[PDB]
């Protein structure tokens, strides 16, 4: 079972510095409240995402359920701010990391599976449910829950998530 990407982080370097206020002035569906999360939030009709336009010019966007959708969205954000009295060349798009989720839906005896790793697997269920794991090839954080849900973060493309899923799958099985 390939694990669905539940979120994506994408970043881009819009060509120029921007004035947050103008954006909040012109498009004005951006809530800009300095000194609390000091960068403008924007959201659009489709796909559903938030995006932090920074005055300094760079940008992050999250909400896409696919690499292609994350692109398509960041493009729209670039287009919109461009209509706001600025020039920006959509460049250097990249996906610093994603997060992928999939639930096996059947608890397993994870006590011994934790000891199987020991140095990697840290397990304190009373503090908080789940189990934090590191997989070598490549580096990626895994959350493995007695409930059955597996979360993964740190990847850059779908292949990393799929291969980490499959690599840790028999161990938990």
């Amino acid at each position: 079972i390939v694990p669905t990407l539940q979120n994506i982080v994408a970043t881009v370097t819009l060509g120029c510095r921007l004035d947050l206020k103008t954006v909040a002035l012109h498009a004005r569906n951006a809530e800009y409240n300095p000194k609390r999360f000091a960068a403008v939030i924007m959201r659009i009709r489709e796909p559903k995402t938030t995006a932090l336009i920074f005055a300094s010019g760079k940008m992050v966007v999250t909400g896409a359920k696919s690499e292609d959708d994350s692109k398509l969205a960041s493009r729209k954000y670039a287009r919109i701010i461009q209509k706001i009295g600025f020039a920006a060349k959509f460049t250097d798009f990249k996906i610093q990391n994603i997060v992928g989720s999939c639930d096996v839906k059947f608890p397993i005896r994870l006590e011994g599976l934790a000891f199987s790793h020991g140095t990697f697997s840290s397990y304190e269920p009373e503090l908080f449910p789940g189990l934090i794991y590191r997989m070598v090839k490549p580096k990626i954080v895994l959350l493995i829950f007695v409930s059955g849900k597996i979360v993964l973060t740190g990847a850059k493309q779908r292949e990393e998530i799929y291969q980490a899923f499959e690599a840790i799958y028999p161990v938990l099985s």
């Binding site: 982080v9 970043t11 012109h26 498009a27 004005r28 569906n29 409240n33 000194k35 609390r36 999360f37 960068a39 959201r43 659009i44 009709r45 489709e46 559903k48 932090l52 920074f54 760079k58 992050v60 999250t62 359920k65 398509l72 493009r75 729209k76 670039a78 287009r79 919109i80 461009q82 209509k83 920006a88 060349k89 959509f90 610093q96 990391n97």
Partner: protein
């Protein structure tokens, strides 16, 4: 007065006399000006015009940022009565208030902190409507969290607000600006949520708790039917406060019982507003209502409550007659809206946001309810128009929807939707929304519907054929958007036959031709975005008619709208997805297909001397992309060069603008790299002219940045005819290097020297030494500059090649190189200690809304690390003391010579 009359373009020159007088004794000028507006022996408009003069008068001298006590005090004192006088007309008080705000935001605390005492006196004792709203405005100007609590000001403000909201005798108009004052207050509350302090946090929490019940009683209050319009404004402001409380403050500060009460009360008010500048007033009021309903989406809802919301919104989201007219007379805006490019955000625009955040069961029940609400409304059309936009809204929500009655309601709904298309009397807008929304229904229930697969083809055929026949292109103007959504989840290329896929393509291509023909710069994106997703669906076999089309589509479309950004990027993206799965055999026909169009761009721009044009840059990008997309096997067939060198050659030659020269240079270098050698050497001299000019005073350092890749590309072909022109290359490169003042570009330039000394060190040093620039040897300054390059060198990647270069350099045994504090020492001595020190350092090993801000935050590859090459070098040279290294090693300091062995 008379001078004010003259000052208030002949008036512009007349006020120059006032400006000249102000140049003298600005301090005294201020009070003299203030007297004019003060005095009643002046036309009220003239007094306002004096006010508006005071704006620019203050900035130049009164505000040091641009760069008398009684005089400034007199201005404020006069304004006290003048601005706040009810008998004054709105314009006069507003002009005065602008002076208040300018002077306050820059000088209020030091000059006059008690201004606030005057304001409380006015707003409390006199109930001055102007005073309270003016205070609200000034709030942001100086009201700091520190001054809010430690200044104690916030306390006086809040208590004034509660006092006023207690006075039922006070007019609705008073309470409006009071509520706006309340929001102004809430903003200071906003930031304190993350970090809390006992004293102020307690007062803040008490303020919130008090405010909530005041707002509740205000909700319960009703106003006279004689004045309904103001009530709407009065109502709207109330709700906006609500939302800022919920979405900005921790749950603890808002209770579930409060949320339920406000939910029911807001729904009832929404219904009443539904039942009633008038229309825009109602409609703007409704938006904050719906936004709160969203922010309390978590709370359960009754089926009757859900029907209330549906039958109310479906009336709210009816577009006016004039908007129908706009999108009928101009559909180019329509897409700007639909793809979220518009600025306008109406109820129709906020409801779509609403239904997304609902959890599953509420969403599913709402879906069920609207399912029947649709069939009930099929007769009246605009009802179905808006209700279908709303159905899209739920459908957009990612969560699944499940229902045993939902299944059959869905079959009936699909039958109704097809009825929409088959009928020929349907209004334009509703059919466009139906085309744009059916794919949402398909996506939401893709798994649910057993007949989904043939149904996808059936709907695509129906909708697209419909998109052939439309005297009005709005139907088509929406079908293209709908096609992206279709391709969101419809693996039609896999499902449908390659002939079926290609015919659907040619179908859309003709649709895009028709629509594009009149497309507005707002839309070019969406069109070409569909173009891309169509491209990705092309089927070894190559059908050149469709591919020729799709290309010319790409380029025509981009032509009119180069400056826009999504057009640029999706264009390049399209272009790349044509050049997939292309071998040298197929690659020919692409040569002829593509190069002529690009060539003609540059040729046309030649009339503009290759001065930057967005289409120019866009084409240079396209050709870089084509270049890169060559099939791995083989080289670049010459005819490609035959076409590409002379236009790109003149591109470089004539142009001087950095970024355009760069966008060319990259393709230039890449071409010259992949090209077969034998074609180049006739072009060698021309390439030398190019590399020279790129390394020349005329061109800036930014241009010189990307000369490098070309350099290595030159060697990649051969060296035989390179050597006689080496000396020329070296002279040009060094003369460019000396004048450069970009440290990044300077580092890049020095990065070139690796291969230059890799092929031969003797000619390099001999020529550079021999050459004199203004009877001055370039070698000495080159070595010094290289030293400073070290002093700021960043990136070990360049360093590894620097070691390869130094292996060539050290054995030259150049005698001249052997021959506050400033390091002026012979090179052979110097370099050894620097690299030994770098090695010594390397011996010592150096090793979610918050997280996003942190998510922001050479020529050759050498597998051997620094240590291996350095140790073998030092073993071979220190023992053999090559190039006067005996003196250097024997006089070497032992501070890090012992650390060397590590």
């Amino acid at each position: 007065n008379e001078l004010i009359i003259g000052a208030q373009h002949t008036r512009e020159v007349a006020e120059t006399q006032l400006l000249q007088w102000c140049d003298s004794d600005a301090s005294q000028v201020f009070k003299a000006l203030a007297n004019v507006a003060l005095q009643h022996e002046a036309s009220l408009e003239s007094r306002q015009f004096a006010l508006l003069s005071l704006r620019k008068l203050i900035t130049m001298y009164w505000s040091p940022g641009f760069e008398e006590i009684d005089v400034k005090d007199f201005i404020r004192e006069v304004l006290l009565k003048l601005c706040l006088n009810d008998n004054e007309n709105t314009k006069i008080k507003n002009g005065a208030s602008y002076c208040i705000v300018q002077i306050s935001a820059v000088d209020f605390p030091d000059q006059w902190p008690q201004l606030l005492t005057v304001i409380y006196d006015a707003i409390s004792h006199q109930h001055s409507l102007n005073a309270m709203s003016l205070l609200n405005e000034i709030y942001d100007d100086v009201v700091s969290e520190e001054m809010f609590f430690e200044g104690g000001i916030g306390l006086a403000t809040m208590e004034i607000v509660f006092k006023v909201l207690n006075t039922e005798t006070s007019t609705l108009i008073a309470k409006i600006a009071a509520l706006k004052l309340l929001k102004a207050c809430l903003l200071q509350m906003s930031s304190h949520n993350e970090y809390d302090e006992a004293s102020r946090k307690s007062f803040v929490s008490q303020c919130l708790a008090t405010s909530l019940q005041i707002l509740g009683q205000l909700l319960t209050l009703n106003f006279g039917n004689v004045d309904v319009i103001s009530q709407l404004k009065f109502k709207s402001i109330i709700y906006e406060n609500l939302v800022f409380i919920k979405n900005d403050f921790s749950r603890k500060h808002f209770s579930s019982e409060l949320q339920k009460q406000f939910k029911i009360m807001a729904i009832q008010d929404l219904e009443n507003v539904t039942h009633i500048p008038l229309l825009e007033t109602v409609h703007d009021c409704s938006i904050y209502i719906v936004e709160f309903l969203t922010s309390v989406c978590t709370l359960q809802f009754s089926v009757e409550e859900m029907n209330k919301i549906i039958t109310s919104l479906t009336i709210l989201c009816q577009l006016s007659s004039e908007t129908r007219e706009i999108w009928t007379s101009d559909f180019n805006t329509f897409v700007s809206k639909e793809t979220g490019l518009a600025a306008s955000y109406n109820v129709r625009d906020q409801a779509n946001e609403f239904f997304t955040s609902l959890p599953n069961p509420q969403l599913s029940l709402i879906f069920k309810v609207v399912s029947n609400d649709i069939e009930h409304s099929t007769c009246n059309y605009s009802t179905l128009e808006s209700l279908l936009y709303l159905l899209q809204c739920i459908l957009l929500n990612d969560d699944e929807i499940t229902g045993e009655n939902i299944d059959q309601s869905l079959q009936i709904l699909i039958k109704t939707l097809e009825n929409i298309l088959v009928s020929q009397e349907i209004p334009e807008l509703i059919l466009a929304r139906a085309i744009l929304t059916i794919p949402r229904v398909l996506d939401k229930f893709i798994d649910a519907l057993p007949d989904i697969k043939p149904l996808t083809s059936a709907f695509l055929a129906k909708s697209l054929n419909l998109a052939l026949k439309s005297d009005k292109e709005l139907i088509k103007s929406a079908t293209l958007i709908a096609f992206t959504y279709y391709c969101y989840f419809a693996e039609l290329d896999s499902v449908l036959g390659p002939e079926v896929c290609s015919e659907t393509q040619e179908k859309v291509i003709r649709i895009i031709n028709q629509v594009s023909s009149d497309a507005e710069e707002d839309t070019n994106g969406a069109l070409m975005e569909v173009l891309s997703q169509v491209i990705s669906y092309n089927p070894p076999h190559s059908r050149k008619e469709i591919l020729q089309a799709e290309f010319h589509l790409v380029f025509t479309i981009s032509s009119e709208d180069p400056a826009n950004v999504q057009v640029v990027v999706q264009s390049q993206e399209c272009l790349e997805k044509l050049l997939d799965n292309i071998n040298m055999d197929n690659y020919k026909n692409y040569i002829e297909l593509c190069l002529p169009s690009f060539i003609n761009v540059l040729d046309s721009n030649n009339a503009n001397n290759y001065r930057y044009s967005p289409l120019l840059s866009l084409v240079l990008e396209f050709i870089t992309v084509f270049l890169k997309k060559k099939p791995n096997d083989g080289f670049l067939p010459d005819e490609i060069n035959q076409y590409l060198f002379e236009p790109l050659a003149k591109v470089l030659a004539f142009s001087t603008e950095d970024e355009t020269l760069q966008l060319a240079t990259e393709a230039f270098s890449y071409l010259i790299f992949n090209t077969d050698t034998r074609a180049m050497e006739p072009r060698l001299m021309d390439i030398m002219k190019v590399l020279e000019r790129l390394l020349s005073l005329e061109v800036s350092d930014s241009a010189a940045m990307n000369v490098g890749p070309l350099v290595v590309a030159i060697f990649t072909r051969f060296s035989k005819e390179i050597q006689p022109l080496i000396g020329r290359i070296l002279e040009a490169v060094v003369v460019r290097l000396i004048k450069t003042q970009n440290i990044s570009t300077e580092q890049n330039l020095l990065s070139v020297l690796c291969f230059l000394t890799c092929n031969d060190p003797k000619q390099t040093v001999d020529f550079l030494s021999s050459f004199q620039i203004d009877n001055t040897d370039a070698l000495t300054l080159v070595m010094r500059k290289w030293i400073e390059a070290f002093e700021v060198i960043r990136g070990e990647k360049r360093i590894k090649e620097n070691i390869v270069a130094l292996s060539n350099l050290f054995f030259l045994n150049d005698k001249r190189l052997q021959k506050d504090r400033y390091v002026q020492v012979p090179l052979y001595t110097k370099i050894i200690k620097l690299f030994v020190s770098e090695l010594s350092f390397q011996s010592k090993q150096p090793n979610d809304y918050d997280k996003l801000k942190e998510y922001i935050d050479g020529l050759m590859d050498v597998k051997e690390s620094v240590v291996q090459l350095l140790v073998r070098f030092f073993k071979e040279v220190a023992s053999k003391d090559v190039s006067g290294f005996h003196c250097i090693y024997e006089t070497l300091s032992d501070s890090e010579r012992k650390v060397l062995s590590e």
